[PDB]
Design a protein around this ligand. Structure first.
Ligand SMILES: Nc1ncnc2c1ncn2[C@@H]1O[C@H](COP(=O)(O)OP(=O)(O)O)[C@@H](O)[C@H]1O
Ligand SMILES: Nc1ncnc2c1ncn2[C@@H]1O[C@H](COP(=O)(O)OP(=O)(O)O)[C@@H](O)[C@H]1O
Ligand SMILES: Nc1ncnc2c1ncn2[C@@H]1O[C@H](COP(=O)(O)OP(=O)(O)O)[C@@H](O)[C@H]1O
Ligand SMILES: Nc1ncnc2c1ncn2[C@@H]1O[C@H](COP(=O)(O)OP(=O)(O)O)[C@@H](O)[C@H]1O
Ligand SMILES: [Mg+2]
Ligand SMILES: [Mg+2]
Lengths: 438, 445, 76, 96, 432, 433
């Protein structure tokens, strides 16, 4: 069965592939080549993990297909799910619901996580017998008794009215393994230790059982609650904000709300209640930002709540959007001074062949050595992405003819069937009048 | 369905079992190389192991780009989601362009849910507690089951149920002679009215009396429900059915598309993965067809890079008939298909060629067959000659006017004279342009 | 906590839009949107054209004496 | 009423074709706002803290001799709206 | 009397003036000349009436004043009021509430009519007595002029009767399937001689016949109306306000399927119509791109368009195209060209306009007015018709003479004379 | 605590005579600019002038924002300091002039005395009195009191599910009822009750507490423009149906001015005029500048500090009108210009050392000299940003201090703007656009 996540462009990248000294291996964890850029990304990753310096900006710049997004995805995979990683495109900040500065602020605040750790008393056991006595008619005080069991304990609890109501709502029966939080009274059923009586009808097919919990009944467990600054801002902006966490529709959050949240989170950090987990915001194709957005970025990185900002662009000296000014990378020089730039050099023949091999391994495609040579030549002549696409194209052509290994004939067939930009442009020049506007 | 549209004759790609394209099959004529490439793309879609792969159909107008995409949709079938879209649709007054594109991406990823619904139907004939000869506690009466007798058209069965159902029976006010159904998967009793055999002609109740259920008391069936990720996203972003003040506000206020967050989409992805792992659901990744991609602006094209690089994205089919045109949203930047070169590096280009006169004649004959029009050989040859000049679309559009003119004249077939008269009555783009140029002073602007 | 703003205005201002009934026409004769969800096609098309009152029927009912009392039910 | 949704309308029973069209799995993938509140109760208790610096009642319009029907009409409108809507606002009590 | 519909620019057009062979008459149903264009319009009209082919586009092109809108109005008149004919201008799709593609989708769905046919059993009578015991059970007595019966009520029926405050003397109908109660009126008795009546109370005669009746309702609604009804809980209100917004595509697909189901069940019939967009050159390139693929649907009406532009600039682009329309869309449509009118045709049109406005003109006046119309424009002569009629009536005349036409020619200027006079005093005017 | 870009700036580093010490309070140069800022700080502390505008002008990296934050540090946390970027006036909810006006009022603060009336105790009697009022009996460790409360308070008590035996807190000013828990005396009755117990209050049932509230004029405007203090259904309806910002009228601001003047006259309020700071002023357009003319001419306005690094640049919103700082000459006539200068290499080394100390980094003298040389070319910002990566490299190699080799290795790994520009120029045909 196929999960919701399938083989994508960067599915083979599991990390930056560095050793302890941050020295890039030639081919490890999907990454091939880009030694200097991977070493720089590793240093930036260490800076992120330390989490002490706020508002650091890194620009990954290079030619198309040089692995800028591959390096960013490797950083994301090496960070892990514990640290927030917000990846957006530059175009996403242009919104009809909020200003560009508001969208950038929300993106920044989605990249900082606030974690609250507290210890609570927890009762986990197998229900042996539950008895609830209620008045036949009219309002009255329900009286009940509950027996809970572990492998080494069994206690009979006298139940209050609200615990009785919770147990009644959860429909707790004998043999149910339940968890009770003493403070809030919340009850969570996690399984059945054994089946219900067989003589009953309309009960359904019984599922698998769950082993009875061991140890003491009332344990003490650590509960961790983690939310981002954006989630706090949204739930504090208005009464209906929690629904805005899913529907968007947050509008523009007042600056007063954000200042109050910054103050409260700082107070929590001083008081040891919460720890701040700074993350990364990755803006792909940052050249789509206009001068107003870049001006906001300049000063938004000066806050102690700002995350590490990583940008990728493949532009040379280009006009800044919203202006008539030519600047390196399409970015104003004031912002370029606030950031370190990581250049990605083009791939050689052996690096291209190794990338193709890793892609074939990820796609479960078997290819011959001659086919690898031809495909590497095609990738050098056309582009790396075209050869990568031909990998699965030739796999499908080979499978159609009841084969097992992708040969040079399959690669030639897909090269004939699917065209690159160069040959398409040549054929379009040959019929320039037939195409509409030139 | 009964009305004949422009691609009503396209029933798929006329491909042999080996993938080679037949000259004329399944309503398609010519375009053999493009059809073979589209067959390879169909195999890619059916393999279900690739995400974010993009295909660009490039060629002059009227060369089968939309016809080829619709043939791909026919090959996949109705099970596979196919979300058509024109580039002009991203410009909305409610949500941003990237949100429209993301929603169209999620529409193409389908989910098929299979579940078994087991129910017990019947008219309650008996409602009897099962007392125990040894009452617990000594006093009173204790019950261990409640026997419910359910009667249908072709049977009657008795169900020994849990004692706890006594409360549900009283809440639903179930008595003898009422029609109820009990769901096995939930253990709940629902009263679907009273039997109609106890209703008199002088009663005035509307939804109280129901027919006695047909079939067996125990009904179980497998329910297959097809949903898309966008359906779940929209149903969770603006939920319908709550009784709180927020749902009331949603009902009162005008509905409006909103920018669904990555949090909700990640939650939907987690739920979908849980269903897939449980065996309830099977993922059906489909196709997003974006016709007139050149109408997208530079922001949409830039967003498509990140959209296609995702591991959840569907297989996107683009189509553009532009040459070295200027990208929208940019000032004097020209790219080979109206598409920036960064996005062209991420797509596989399928080239569509122009049609020879023989292929045009074949397509005209096929369209005449689809429209229920009998055309003579001489009329067909004249219409093909008309199609050599002018265009192919113009020739296929003369078939129904010529048929109407023949019917008015009292003939059951189109002759050459009918096509000549229609050609005189209606002008093509080139002839109208010649008239406009010859009289540019008398026209406006 | 602050007290609200007490905005004081002339009492004549609150009657600016008010028009006496003897000075305005009945706008309910043009009320199309008010009929939706309350008035059916049956009433407008089939029933009312047949069962509209006439002046003659109204006058006859008004002038005629009270109808005889309804007989009590008899089990027959 | 629920047009084009994974949630089906209220089928009267198995005799209706809508009974066998929709699944409980699709229903459980859609969360009502009350379910969302129950899902975020711990977050609501720990992370909802921002208070407005100032709090005021709405501005009031005062005239010496107002139309004697305006105030009772507004009072009746408010009373009916409160009687119909206040029970529906109880789930939002902790946030407020 | 003066009704709301008065003499307009196309009030004299009643049809296309064709015979059974679609051959245009020289002057029939208010149309003069444009023989080829009228024949093409008639062929397109037969295509519309057949309804078999979906998404057919025709462009009526020609010089200004050559009868393009005249031909469109002739098509609309010849087509029955049963078949929808949505006439919009190009500028109306630029809305502050919905996108251009949404506006065009709504216009397209407004051009397809759906005729529904519902047959329903009802109970119809005058309420005699309502007795409720205690509110679990009660009895209701209903009567006609020929019948009287008593009914046993349940809980929901009693609740529905109490909610509507149904009492004695009320004339009500009850739907047997759903139980909904609508009050038609109340019976008039000697004791109901009210001095003041509520805004909804009305007195009706007691129904005759049988208490159980069948109600058959046939109405024509468009696809856009069904979309708006199902867009929100009270979506029918948006059919008055127009605050529709952008209807979800899933709702439209559900409605297309439901309409097909109704068509199979015999409860609905589809009447595809015409969407006429006048002055299409106002559409932007995005709108044309959307039109390209909107016409390819199986639920697309006939799109009739009209432009008077030469090779001009497409709106939203810097490109020049033969009608202001991109050549990709022009390949999807048949072009009907209108030729300039001759002296005889201009005089015949002036005669038709004079007959429409009830103006008597001498033959010398007709010659002078035709010369003016050829020299300046046909619309200028048409306006001078009414101007000269007014001047003639002012001097207590009965027939417009050459003097009246000359007088109104001196009083009212066409574009050429006004432009010349402006050029004489160019510095006086602002921002030359 | 995370270290930001200005974490070392603690003040203006001025002596008692107003002169600027060379290196003090995290500032190394800009003596003239620091002395001018000291004068501006004294002006803000005077609380006499209104709408006085200051422009900090100079090339990037010359510490304009550092000087503004140093003014903030000199003023203290009591004096309001509203930092806004010029790009923030382009809201999709309210007009640009409204955004500017709201930021103007945020800069004016108000310290107001308030008395809170508190009913706190364990509930002993909750008797409705027919709209139904409530008669409530509260007990503490010091006594018992019976109170009659409004029906709204009874509804709040019902929503909190307050029953006999629960410890409650009532704020009489806001009518805010909080149920804290079941009294501790009942914590032994059951073993599992699903309740949170709270001790009995140890004060009196009725308490009055006087506190000082820090608010701004904008807060009053918002509270009176989007009211939520009535606790009625209409307030909830307005909040849910109209959540967006609105363009607050001058009438509301006049009413708020009257209310605040009345409070100040009553002696229960103190006004703190405060400061507004606009960092990227060149991002404002001609409409904003024209509005700022009249806004600064107001006698209510705060002190506004503007910043700009632009040269003779085209004013946004104009076609081709070019002005010395991106600011039209009319607004420049209304400002006092403070000029910041470029830093000498010695000052660059001093700032690098201060940043290294701030970030907890030990750097050798050879490394400091090399990094100052690196900052002589490129920029000071680039040289400062190499400190943490070099420290990470030294830590990886086991060194507790940065040597010159680590700085060289990091500079080899990371390029600056000029080096990247050179690479782009050399390979213009390979990069996009
Ligand atoms: N060094 C690398 N190691 C492994 N895969 C790579 C490398 N560089 C590029 N790729 C792959 O090749 C494709 C193009 O690289 P990408 O990072 O998308 O280029 P860009 O710099 O334009 O973002 C992607 O599928 C990416 O995963
Ligand atoms: N190879 C083909 N076989 C059959 N019909 C075709 C073929 N190519 C085009 N058509 C038909 O001709 C018409 C032209 O539309 P299409 O070719 O899709 O234009 P475009 O490719 O520019 O979108 C459509 O009715 C299409 O179905
Ligand atoms: N063939 C015709 N028969 C009768 N009236 C016509 C004819 N052609 C034009 N007219 C009249 O002349 C006027 C201008 O023609 P119209 O069709 O509106 O111009 P256009 O074609 O530029 O839209 C209208 O009043 C119209 O009724
Ligand atoms: N005189 C100074 N002393 C110490 N640090 C300074 C000085 N000037 C600037 N800095 C620091 O150098 C960086 C650049 O200064 P900044 O105020 O951002 O310049 P700009 O005028 O471009 O805003 C900031 O980290 C700032 O704290
Ligand atoms: Mg990339
Ligand atoms: Mg016209």
């Amino acid at each position: 069965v196929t999960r919701i996540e399938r083989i994508g462009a960067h599915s083979h990248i599991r990390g930056l592939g560095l050793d302890d000294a941050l020295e890039p291996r030639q081919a490890s964890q999907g990454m091939v080549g880009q030694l200097a850029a991977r070493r720089a990304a590793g240093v930036v990753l260490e800076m992120i993990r330390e989490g002490k310096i706020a508002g650091r900006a890194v620009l990954i710049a290079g030619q198309p297909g040089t692995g800028k997004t591959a390096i960013a995805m490797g950083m994301a995979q090496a960070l892990g799910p514990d640290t927030p990683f917000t990846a957006i495109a530059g175009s996403e900040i242009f919104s009809l619901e909020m200003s560009k500065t508001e969208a950038l602020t929300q993106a920044f605040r989605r990249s900082i996580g606030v974690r609250i750790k507290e210890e609570t008393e927890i009762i986990e056991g197998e229900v042996v017998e539950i008895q609830i006595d209620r008045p036949a008619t009219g309002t009255g005080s329900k009286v009940g008794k509950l027996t809970l069991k572990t492998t080494e304990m069994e206690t009979i609890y006298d139940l209050g009215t609200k615990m009785i109501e919770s147990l009644t709502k959860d429909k707790v029966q004998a043999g149910d393994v339940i968890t009770i939080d003493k403070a809030t009274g919340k009850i969570s059923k996690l399984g059945r230790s054994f089946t219900r009586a067989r003589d009953y009808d309309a009960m359904g097919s019984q599922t698998k059982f769950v082993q009875c919990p061991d140890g003491e009944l009332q344990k003490r467990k650590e509960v961790v609650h983690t939310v981002s600054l954006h989630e706090i801002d949204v739930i504090n902006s208005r009464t209906q904000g929690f629904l805005a966490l899913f529907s968007g529709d947050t509008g523009e959050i007042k600056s007063e709300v954000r200042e109050q949240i910054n103050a409260k989170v700082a107070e929590w950090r001083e008081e040891g209640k919460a720890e701040i987990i700074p993350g990364v915001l990755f803006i792909d194709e940052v050249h789509m930002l206009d001068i107003e957005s870049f001006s906001f970025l300049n000063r938004a990185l000066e806050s102690d709540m700002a995350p590490v900002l990583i940008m990728a662009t493949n532009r040379g000296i280009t006009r800044i959007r919203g202006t008539s000014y030519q600047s390196p990378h399409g970015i104003p020089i004031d912002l370029l001074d606030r950031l370190l730039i990581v250049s990605t050099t083009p791939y050689s023949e052996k690096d291209t062949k190794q990338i193709l091999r890793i892609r074939c391994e990820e796609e479960d495609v078997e290819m011959s050595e001659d086919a690898y040579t031809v495909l590497t030549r095609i990738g050098l002549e056309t582009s790396l992405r075209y050869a990568i696409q031909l990998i699965t194209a030739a796999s499908l052509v080979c499978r159609k003819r009841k084969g097992t290994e992708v040969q040079v004939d399959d690669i030639k067939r897909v090269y004939s069937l699917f065209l690159d930009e160069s040959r398409s442009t040549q054929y379009m020049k040959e019929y320039q009048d037939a195409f509409l506007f030139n | 369905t009964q009305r004949i549209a422009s691609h009503s004759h396209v029933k798929g790609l006329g491909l042999d079992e080996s993938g080679l394209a037949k000259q004329a099959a399944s309503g398609l004529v010519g375009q053999e190389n493009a059809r073979e490439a589209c067959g390879v793309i169909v195999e890619l879609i059916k393999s279900k192991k690739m995400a974010g792969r993009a295909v660009l159909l490039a060629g002059p107008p009227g060369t089968g780009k939309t016809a080829l995409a619709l043939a791909i949709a026919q090959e996949l079938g109705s099970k596979v989601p196919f979300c058509p879209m024109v580039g002009s649709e991203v410009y909305s007054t409610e949500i941003k362009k990237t949100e429209v594109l993301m929603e169209n991406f999620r529409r193409a990823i389908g989910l098929r849910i299979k579940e078994t619904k087991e129910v017990y139907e019947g008219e309650v004939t008996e409602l009897t507690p099962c007392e125990t000869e040894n009452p617990m506690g000594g006093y009173g009466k204790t019950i261990s089951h409640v026997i419910i007798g359910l009667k249908t058209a072709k049977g009657t069965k008795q169900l020994k149920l849990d004692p706890s159902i006594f409360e549900s029976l009283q809440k639903e006010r179930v008595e003898a002679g009422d029609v109820i159904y009990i769901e096995a998967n939930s253990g709940a009793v629902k009263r679907q009215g009273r039997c109609d055999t106890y209703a008199t002609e002088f009663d005035l109740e509307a939804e109280e009396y129901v027919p006695l259920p047909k079939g067996d008391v125990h009904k179980k069936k497998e329910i297959i429900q097809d949903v898309t990720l966008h359906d779940l996203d929209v149903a969770n972003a603006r939920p319908q059915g709550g009784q709180d003040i927020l749902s009331m506000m949603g009902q009162l206020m005008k509905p409006k598309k909103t920018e669904i967050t990555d949090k909700l989409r990640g939650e939907i992805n987690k739920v979908v993965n849980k269903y897939i792992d449980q065996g309830i659901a099977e993922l059906v990744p489909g196709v997003l067809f974006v016709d007139e991609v050149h109408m997208l602006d530079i922001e949409c094209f830039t967003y498509l890079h990140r959209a296609l690089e995702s591991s959840i994205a569907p297989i996107v089919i683009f189509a553009s008939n532009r040459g070295n045109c200027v990208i929208r949203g940019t000032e004097d930047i020209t790219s080979p298909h109206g598409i920036p070169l960064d996005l062209l590096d991420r797509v596989m280009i399928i080239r569509t060629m122009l049609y020879t006169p023989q292929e045009m004649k074949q397509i005209i004959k096929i369209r005449a067959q689809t429209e229920g029009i009998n055309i003579s050989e001489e009329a067909l040859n004249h219409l093909g000659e008309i199609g050599t000049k002018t265009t192919l679309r113009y020739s296929v559009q003369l078939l129904t006017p010529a048929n109407l003119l023949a019917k008015i004249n009292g003939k059951d077939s189109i002759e050459k004279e009918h096509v000549e008269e229609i050609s005189e009555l209606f002008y093509d783009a080139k002839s109208s342009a010649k008239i406009l140029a010859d009289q540019q002073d008398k026209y406006m602007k | 906590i602050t007290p609200g703003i007490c905005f004081s205005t002339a009492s004549l201002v609150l009657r600016a839009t008010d028009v006496h009934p003897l000075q305005r026409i009945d706008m309910g004769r043009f009320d199309l949107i008010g009929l939706e969800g309350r008035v059916s096609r049956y009433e407008a098309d089939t029933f009312l054209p047949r069962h509209r009152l006439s002046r003659r029927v109204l006058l006859e009912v008004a002038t005629a004496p009270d109808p005889p009392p309804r007989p009590k039910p008899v089990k027959m | 009423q629920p047009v084009a949704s994974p949630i089906g309308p209220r089928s009267p029973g198995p005799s209706h074709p809508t009974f066998w069209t929709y699944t409980e799995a699709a229903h459980r993938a859609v969360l009502f706002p009350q379910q969302r509140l129950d899902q975020l109760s711990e977050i609501i208790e720990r992370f909802i803290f921002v208070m407005p610096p100032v709090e005021a009642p709405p501005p009031s319009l005062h005239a010496c001799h107002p139309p004697p029907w305006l105030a009772p009409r507004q009072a009746a409108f408010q009373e009916q709206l409160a009687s119909e809507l206040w029970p529906r606002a109880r789930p939002l009590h902790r946030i407020v």
